[PDB]
Design a protein around this ligand. Structure first.
Ligand SMILES: Nc1ncnc2c1ncn2[C@@H]1O[C@H](COP(=O)(O)OP(=O)(O)NP(=O)(O)O)[C@@H](O)[C@H]1O
Ligand SMILES: Nc1ncnc2c1ncn2[C@@H]1O[C@H](COP(=O)(O)OP(=O)(O)NP(=O)(O)O)[C@@H](O)[C@H]1O
Ligand SMILES: CC[N+](CC)(CC)CC
Ligand SMILES: NCCC[C@H](N)C(=O)O
Ligand SMILES: [Cl-]
Ligand SMILES: [Cl-]
Ligand SMILES: [Cl-]
Ligand SMILES: [Cl-]
Ligand SMILES: [K+]
Ligand SMILES: [K+]
Ligand SMILES: [K+]
Ligand SMILES: [K+]
Ligand SMILES: [Mn+2]
Ligand SMILES: [Mn+2]
Ligand SMILES: [Mn+2]
Lengths: 379, 1073
């Protein structure tokens, strides 16, 4: 018998079973309502320093596969589930969940009341916690480490997960029939996008490439100047972990891009950054949005779309600069989900148009971006 | 826009009598719509022949019509109610089909009725197989290698194409009706023959084989703004090849990666869009090749389905309610999510933090010579649903919630039976209703998961789970009661193990495990259903039990509670009537100020609706499960009289365990339920009962039989629906059916009752408050005693019985009510022979005739009796005098013989009907004709009639023959009948039996020579001799009667017009003074 234990800042204990690597894990604990796409969720960089709790009891039913990786590694700090299936049963499976977690050296616990945990977080808001998996896990030590957690509030995580050297991406999206395609030749890509890497999901890139862009990924801290110098047909601002607030560099630079006529697009963090760069304010939500069933309204067309969400922070609507016009809102809590510059060719989305995992509903948000780009090209 | 202006009045098309493949789902659906609209300021008019439904409650809709669901009849309703729109999507196939014929016949057009929810083209687009297929290809979805057939010659050629095995699927049918798996040529013609005839469009869709692929369904809802959502996804346990309705299924889907889900999801939406569904919800089914994710579209249902009900109960998402509203132009974003206290919009996709399991409920034991292998045509009669935090937990609960005697995985074969692996093999290879239990037996027997997968095609994801429970079970067996430490016991409770299963394994008493649990403090917690996985709070109390940490029960201390125990899955003999009563008891008491708690796990019910009671425990109706809730609810009282045989059997145990049982006592119930005890009561009362004896063993039975004399009726204790009941003609008839009678007798004796020949059967429903007895109604049966009350047609008032004799019965009822200590409802059964009242039995509870009588008398008996049970007397309620309506009311039943062809469609002491209809008339004749038509009888007012009667009926046959002649029929008869008729002066046309020559009856019936068939038999052998007329009459769709009284009634009906006049229930009730 292999123990594990999860302790919340508030002193609440969850005793269960160890399902991943031996050791401890500390982070901000979050709940995710997705019924499918746990692997994609795990390899999502925005989860860095976060201990992810899944609401759907059985996690690992389909095993894992490389195509289902949204990044080169597992970003989640920890994994909290109700039940780890006996077997993985899917033709796409290459490695059972346990193995995978261990391999990625992830501390993970199973067999706990995730529902009670969910209700707690939803009720009393996000909390930091600690998971200790091993022989005799020390509940007081766990608490200590949890308590000692700093807090993603004011935590710039973007810098921590970003790429070292800028790079090129020309790879398209996955197909059932073909799987992950072969990278394309630059010449096959009309458009040329520059992407800030704030801890970006591969699906963003693929979907872009999918729409005719040849990409160049750059570190979060890259200078607008350095940027402009490549003559990009459009710029893009990825998703990523932590507080967007603290990221002055990127803020600064974005400000610098909005002086020019280049089209710009921000997803999630990028959304927050751009809103920041537009003089808007960002807040940290009670528990945030994490799932794949989130209704979002395109206020403009008065059309609803089910989306993939993952965000602990948000942009304050009642502090929005006039130049900032609301394109979208959440139908669950009326939060701000999308914005557009009145003056510029810059807009953003709070959720994930790229899904992975999740509904494909918001993928057209990309198309806008392509419109904006072919237009600047006409120019 | 918001809700529509040009529409004020809506006509909701009901689904008719419950039949296999088309059951309670719609009453649930129908009733949802009704409430939805009405809550929305709309005039609601609805038509439904079924009296047992809630939807036909006069207080449910503005205009309620209990009329035959015939376009001519529906016509007259339109004509009279001048409805604006018509909602034809909440009544299954009956409704779609009718909506379409109204349309065809230009009736809609004729009166300006707008078709809402779904248009006629959309409907056809999906209902039509060729069309559907064509759409699939147009939107690039894949379907199974097929072809369309309009003929046999054409079906042959497509079969010679796709190959065997092949899948037959007619257009405009559901429940796999008229379909099946052709594994050869012989099978092929028989199936196609049936489908082509069955098809409204005379069209079959023939497919290649996808047998063994995974099977999935998705429930989608689409609005006028084009908003689209997946309400629920479902993964089938049983693979492609076994109709979803006959399969164990779970929600949500379990073995798809996000990538496959999305594909499936997109396809689902693509499909609704392509077909034209804009203002509702539909079900899209798919097949998946486990080996490669290859997706294939199976079909679409442009209406609500049985999965919608299940899907609804599974997520807390009110499908039918929403859809209704959507049909009047409401949009998803507009609509609030019920359960989250309207905190969120209905436009979202539900997320659940538990596992839902549904298992079908069968009744193969009632249909001996039937093929009991599961296939593409539905055979089940009901379904149970369970919720658990884990699949194991979910599954086990469902097993015990099914009410088939299982505690969970009880063994089917012995471990020390040489032939055991062979039986297992078979059962696995060729699924029967018993498969799940055999799968466990296979693990006990040494078969591997792989070995099982190969035979079953059931995903290993499920299999390993069952193997693990088996291993845990073997441990319990080894360690025994001593090994039941808290840790282990706790682990066991968590995997769904029932105290009862643990008990058998540990070779102890269930009460011992429960005690042990007590010691340990091992009790379950209650979670709530909320549509969102706890993302938001809910103020609704829709809960399920689980063994975890946190409890969300939060019980009131505030009020006096009343617990109502539900009937579990529907089944022959115990159906919707019992739901209707439960719903009413809650409605009543609640209104009276009590906090009402419902315990039930039938998803297709209104009782399992969160609007219905204060509290809802979606749990198996077992002793263990009920005790736990009681433990926490601490109710004022519990009602065990409104949910069938179940809670009835639990009574003693409950009371004994401290449960506060209200209404008729457990001892009292036992006086009535135990045949020997009942027998005494009759004696002590100086009442008349046949010559009989109560017995426990054959030899003695045999001996006693000699005494009583044959023929004789074998009646077990503690059964309803005539389970295992049989008329015995001799010793050996006896030895053959005796054990079976005992096996179902509940440690109570089996009655041996002398058969009462040429006697009239009577049912009496009454209420006793200990002070007074209120007679609800006396119903005289058409078919004689010997034909189960549930299978007989009946009249209210009686149509032939003297007042003098009825009065004799009213008194016996009262005498009995009082002696037996009845408190609430009771149902009394009598037989009239020679102007002599005979007592057959007493049902110490609400009976299946209750809803009908209520509807007929305008008195809500379930409500009244519920109040009496809770303390309020009849006097106090002011319900003290028996009502005798001004009109006639006739009940007729619908039988499933057409689903089980290898069965002799004979009537008897054991109930086999699945549903019923109500006929209301100015006369008995008018009532009957209406009943007969609504029962979907093929009877004509002219043609040739075939007469083939038994000896006893040789006297009244003349009168019957005569009557047919005066009507313009032309007669044919067989030998003996012809002789008698000849002697009367009636000269039928001679017809050759099958052994007599050619052409014979079969030939002539088969040729379509006849429009009516009257065939009566007597005796085991003479029955088996005439089986072919019956089977052929059925196959060829000719109205047939198997009782002379039946024939006489038919005859009368000939002098009436069921389409003549229509009347609302409101209006019927108003005619009562
Ligand atoms: N190609 C095929 N191979 C094997 N099995 C099949 C195939 N097509 C269908 N089936 C099975 O046949 C069943 C019935 O098909 P279906 O189209 O749902 O009939 P239906 O009568 O319209 N259903 P319903 O309206 O819900 O009562 C399915 O549940 C499958 O298990
Ligand atoms: N002695 C008898 N003579 C003739 N017919 C009889 C006799 N006993 C019973 N029957 C027939 O057998 C049927 C079933 O007997 P019954 O005892 O009522 O069964 P049951 O299962 O308790 N029925 P129920 O509780 O109403 O669903 C009756 O409806 C009669 O048609
Ligand atoms: C579903 C019920 N029917 C087909 C629509 C057959 C009983 C109506 C007659
Ligand atoms: N109410 C019973 C149905 C009667 C059937 N037509 C037959 O006579 O057997
Ligand atoms: Cl816990
Ligand atoms: Cl294939
Ligand atoms: Cl142990
Ligand atoms: Cl059969
Ligand atoms: K635990
Ligand atoms: K199936
Ligand atoms: K269909
Ligand atoms: K009868
Ligand atoms: Mn269908
Ligand atoms: Mn009975
Ligand atoms: Mn009876």
């Amino acid at each position: 018998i292999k123990s594990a234990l999860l302790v919340l800042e508030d002193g609440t204990q969850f005793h269960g079973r160890a399902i991943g690597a031996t050791g401890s894990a500390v982070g901000e604990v979050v709940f995710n309502t997705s019924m499918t796409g746990y692997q994609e969720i795990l390899t999502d960089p925005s989860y860095s320093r976060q201990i992810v709790t899944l609401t759907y009891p059985h996690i690992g039913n389909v095993g894992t596969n490389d195509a289902d990786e949204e990044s080169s590694q597992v970003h989640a700090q920890g994994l909290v589930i109700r039940d780890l299936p006996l077997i993985a049963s899917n033709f796409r499976n290459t490695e059972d969940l346990s193995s995978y977690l261990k391999r990625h050296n992830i501390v993970a616990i199973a067999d706990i009341d995730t529902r009670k945990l969910t209700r707690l977080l939803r009720e009393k808001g996000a909390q930091n916690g600690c998971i200790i998996a091993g022989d005799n896990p020390d509940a007081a030590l766990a608490l200590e480490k949890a308590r000692a957690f700093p807090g993603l509030n004011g935590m710039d995580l973007a810098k921590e997960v970003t790429t070292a050297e800028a790079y090129s991406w020309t790879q398209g999206s996955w197909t059932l029939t073909g799987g992950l395609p072969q990278a394309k030749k630059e010449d096959e890509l009309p458009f040329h996008v520059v992407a800030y890497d704030f801890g970006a999901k591969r699906n963003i890139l693929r979907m872009l490439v999918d729409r005719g862009c040849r990409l160049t990924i750059v570190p979060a801290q890259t200078s607008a100047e350095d940027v402009l110098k490549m003559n990009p047909d459009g710029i893009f601002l990825s998703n990523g972990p932590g507080d967007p607030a603290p990221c002055d560099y990127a803020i600064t630079a974005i400000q610098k891009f909005l002086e020019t006529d280049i089209p710009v697009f921000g997803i999630c963090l990028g959304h927050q950054l751009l809103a920041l760069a537009s003089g808007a304010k960002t807040v940290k939500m009670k528990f945030g949005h994490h799932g794949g069933n989130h209704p979002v309204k395109d206020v403009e067309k008065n059309v609803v779309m089910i989306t993939a969400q993952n965000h602990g922070f948000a942009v304050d609507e009642a502090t929005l600069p006039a130049n900032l016009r609301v394109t979208h809102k959440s139908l669950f809590d009326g939060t701000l989900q999308g914005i557009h510059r009145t003056d510029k060719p810059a807009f953003s989305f709070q959720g994930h148009p790229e899904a992975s995992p999740g509904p494909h509903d918001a993928a057209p948000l990309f198309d806008h971006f392509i419109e904006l780009i072919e237009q600047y090209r006409k120019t | 826009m918001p809700k529509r202006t040009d529409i004020k009045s809506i006509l909701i098309l009901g689904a008719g009598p419950i039949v296999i493949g088309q059951a309670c789902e719609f009453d649930y659906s129908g009733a949802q719509a009704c409430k939805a609209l009405r809550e929305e300021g709309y005039r609601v008019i609805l038509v439904n022949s079924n009296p047992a439904t809630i939807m036909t409650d006069p207080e449910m809709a503005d205009a309620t019509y209990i009329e035959p669901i015939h376009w001519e009849v529906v016509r007259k309703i339109i004509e009279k109610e001048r409805p604006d729109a018509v909602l034809p999507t909440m009544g299954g196939q009956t409704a779609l089909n009718c909506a379409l014929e109204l349309e065809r016949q230009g009736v809609l057009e004729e009166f300006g009725v707008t078709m809402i929810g779904a248009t006629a083209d959309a409907i056809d687009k999906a209902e039509d197989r060729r069309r559907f297929d064509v759409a699939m290809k147009k939107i690039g979805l894949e379907t199974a290698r097929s072809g369309i057939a309009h003929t046999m010659e054409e079906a042959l050629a497509v079969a010679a194409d796709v190959g065997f095995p092949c899948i037959i699927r007619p257009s405009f049918t559901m429940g796999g009706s008229g379909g099946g798996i052709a594994y050869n040529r012989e099978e092929f013609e028989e199936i196609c023959a049936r489908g082509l005839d069955l098809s409204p469009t005379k069209e079959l869709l023939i497919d290649e084989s996808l047998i063994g692929w995974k099977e999935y369904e998705m429930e989608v809802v689409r609005d006028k703004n084009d908003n689209c959502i997946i309400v629920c996804s479902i993964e089938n346990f049983d693979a492609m090849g076994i109709h979803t309705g006959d399969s164990i299924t779970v929600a949500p889907a379990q073995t798809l990666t996000d990538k496959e889900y999305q594909i499936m999801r997109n396809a689902s939406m693509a499909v609704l869009r392509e077909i034209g569904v804009e203002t509702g919800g539909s079900n899209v089914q798919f097949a998946v090749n486990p080996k490669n994710g290859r997706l294939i579209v199976i079909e679409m249902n442009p209406r609500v389905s049985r999965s919608s009900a299940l899907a609804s109960k599974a997520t807390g998402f009110p499908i039918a309610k929403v859809a209704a509203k959507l049909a009047v132009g409401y949009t998803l974003d507009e609509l609030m999510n019920d359960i989250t206290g309207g905190r969120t919009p209905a436009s979202f996709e539900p997320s659940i933090d538990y596992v839902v399991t549904k298992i079908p409920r069968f009744n193969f034991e009632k249909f001996a010579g039937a093929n009991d292998r599961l296939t593409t045509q539905m055979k089940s009669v009901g379904e149970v649903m369970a919720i658990g935090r884990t699949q194991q937990e979910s599954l086990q609960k469902a097993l015990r919630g099914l009410e088939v005697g299982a505690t969970g995985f009880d063994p089917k074969v012995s471990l020390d039976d040489p032939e055991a692996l062979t039986k297992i093999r078979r059962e696995l290879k060729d699924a029967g209703a018993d498969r799940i239990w055999y799968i466990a037996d296979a693990f006990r027997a040494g078969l591997s998961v792989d070995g099982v997968f190969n035979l079953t095609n059931i995903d290993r994801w499920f299999l390993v789970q069952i193997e693990e429970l088996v291993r845990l079970e073997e441990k319990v067996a080894e360690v025994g009661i001593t090994g039941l430490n808290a840790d282990f016991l706790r682990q066991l409770k968590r995997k769904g193990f029932a105290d009862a299963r643990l008990a058998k394994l540990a070779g102890v008493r269930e009460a011992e495990i429960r005690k042990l649990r007590d010691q340990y403090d091992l009790h379950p917690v209650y979670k709530r259903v909320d549509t969102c996985a706890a993302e938001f709070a809910t103020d609704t109390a829709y809960m399920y039990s689980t063994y975890e940490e946190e409890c969300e029960a939060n019980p009131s201390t505030d009020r006096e509670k009343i617990m109502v125990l539900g009937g579990g899955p529907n089944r022959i003999g115990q159906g919707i009537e019992f739901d209707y009563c439960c719903v009413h008891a809650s409605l009543a008491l609640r209104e009276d100020g009590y906090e009402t708690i419902m315990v039930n796990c039938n998803p297709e019910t209104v009782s399992t609706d969160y609007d219905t009671s204060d509290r809802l425990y979606f749990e198996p109706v077992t002793l263990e499960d009920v005790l736990e809730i009681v433990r926490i609810e601490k109710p004022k009282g519990v009602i065990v009289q409104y949910g069938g045989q179940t809670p009835l059997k639990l009574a003693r145990a409950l009371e004994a365990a401290g449960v506060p049982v209200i209404g008729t006592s457990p001892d009292a119930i036992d006086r009535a339920e135990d045949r020997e005890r009942f027998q005494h009561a009759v004696e002590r009362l100086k009442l008349k009962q046949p010559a009989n004896a109560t017995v426990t063993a054959i030899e003695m039975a045999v001996e006693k039989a000699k005494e009583i004399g044959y023929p004789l009726v074998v009646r077990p204790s503690y059964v309803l629906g005539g389970r295992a009941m049989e008329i015995v003609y001799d010793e050996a008839d006896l030895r053959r059916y005796f054990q079976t009678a005992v096996s179902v007798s509940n440690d109570a004796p089996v009655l041996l009752d002398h058969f009462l020949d040429d006697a009239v059967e009577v049912d009496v429903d009454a209420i006793c408050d200990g002070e007074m007895v209120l007679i609800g109604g006396i119903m005289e049966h058409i078919e004689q005693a010997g034909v189960h009350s549930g299978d007989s047609a009946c009249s209210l008032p009686a149509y032939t019985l003297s007042q003098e004799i009825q009065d004799v019965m009213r008194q016996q009822v009262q005498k009995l009510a009082f002696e037996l200590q009845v408190r609430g409802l009771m149902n009394v059964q009598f037989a009239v022979k020679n102007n002599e009242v005979y007592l057959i039995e007493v049902n110490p509870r609400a009976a299946r005739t209750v809803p009908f009588v209520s509807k007929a008398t305008g008195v809500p008996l379930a409500k009244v009796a519920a109040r009496v049970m809770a303390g309020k007397s009849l006097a106090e309620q002011g319900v003290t005098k028996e009502v005798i309506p001004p009109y006639y009311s006739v009940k007729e039943v619908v039988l499933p013989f057409n689903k089980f062809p290898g069965v002799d469609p004979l009537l008897g002491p054991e109930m086999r009907s699945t549903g019923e209809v109500m006929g209301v008339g100015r006369t008995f004749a008018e009532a009957f004709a209406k009943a007969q038509l609504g029962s979907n009888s093929t009877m004509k007012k002219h043609g040739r009639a075939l007469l083939s009667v038994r000896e006893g009926d040789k006297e009244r046959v003349v009168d019957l023959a005569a009557k047919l002649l005066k009507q313009g029929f032309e007669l044919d008869a067989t030998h003996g009948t012809a002789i008698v008729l000849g002697e009367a002066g009636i000269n039928p046309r001679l017809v050759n039996k099958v052994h007599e020559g050619r052409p014979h009856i079969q030939d002539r019936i088969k040729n379509g020579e006849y429009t009516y068939i009257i065939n009566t038999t007597s005796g085991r052998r003479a029955i088996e001799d005439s089986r072919v007329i019956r089977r052929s009459a059925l196959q060829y769709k000719v109205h047939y009667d198997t009782t002379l009284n039946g024939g006489f009634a038919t005859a009368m009906a000939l002098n009436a017009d069921a389409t003549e006049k229509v009347i609302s229930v409101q209006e019927m009730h108003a005619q009562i003074k």
